[PDB]
Coordinates of C-alpha atoms in Angstrom, one line a residue:
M1 CA -1.7 -81.9 -3.6
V2 CA -2.0 -82.9 0.0
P3 CA -5.0 -81.2 2.1
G4 CA -2.3 -79.7 4.4
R5 CA -0.7 -82.0 6.9
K6 CA -0.4 -85.8 6.5
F7 CA 2.1 -88.4 7.9
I8 CA 3.2 -91.9 7.1
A9 CA 3.9 -94.8 9.1
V10 CA 7.7 -96.4 8.5
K11 CA 7.7 -98.8 11.4
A12 CA 5.2 -100.8 13.5
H13 CA 3.8 -100.1 16.8
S14 CA 1.0 -101.3 19.6
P15 CA -1.1 -99.4 22.1
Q16 CA 0.5 -99.4 25.4
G17 CA -3.0 -99.3 26.7
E18 CA -4.6 -96.1 27.2
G19 CA -3.7 -92.9 24.9
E20 CA -1.7 -95.0 22.4
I21 CA -2.6 -96.0 18.8
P22 CA -1.0 -99.3 16.7
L23 CA 1.2 -98.7 13.5
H24 CA 1.9 -100.5 10.5
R25 CA 4.6 -99.9 7.7
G26 CA 2.7 -98.0 4.7
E27 CA -0.2 -96.9 7.0
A28 CA -1.4 -93.3 6.9
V29 CA -0.7 -91.3 9.9
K30 CA -2.3 -88.0 10.9
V31 CA 0.0 -85.9 13.1
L32 CA -2.2 -83.2 15.3
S33 CA -0.6 -82.5 18.6
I34 CA 3.0 -83.1 19.8
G35 CA 4.2 -84.5 23.3
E36 CA 7.7 -84.1 24.8
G37 CA 9.9 -85.4 22.3
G38 CA 9.0 -88.8 20.5
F39 CA 5.2 -89.0 21.2
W40 CA 2.8 -87.1 19.0
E41 CA -1.1 -87.2 19.0
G42 CA -2.8 -88.2 15.8
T43 CA -5.0 -90.4 13.8
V44 CA -4.4 -93.4 11.9
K45 CA -6.7 -96.0 9.9
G46 CA -9.5 -94.5 12.0
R47 CA -8.2 -94.7 15.3
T48 CA -6.8 -91.9 17.6
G49 CA -4.1 -91.5 19.9
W50 CA -0.4 -91.1 20.3
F51 CA 2.1 -92.7 18.9
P52 CA 6.0 -92.7 18.4
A53 CA 7.3 -90.1 15.9
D54 CA 10.2 -92.5 15.3
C55 CA 8.0 -94.6 13.5
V56 CA 6.1 -92.0 11.6
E57 CA 7.6 -89.5 8.6
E58 CA 6.2 -86.4 7.3
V59 CA 4.9 -86.3 3.7
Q60 CA 7.6 -83.3 3.4
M61 CA 10.3 -86.4 3.7

């Protein structure tokens, strides 16, 4: 049983520069904050920052 809230990356993505983290299909992402409508803040592979929700999927799905 999950600890509470977990996410998984379905697509790839790179850090635009400051305030963004990379992404890789099969990676374990952890959503924490929510931006406007597509960019959420979380942690993945140890790296922290914002990422495109369109490339992440909640364990609920």
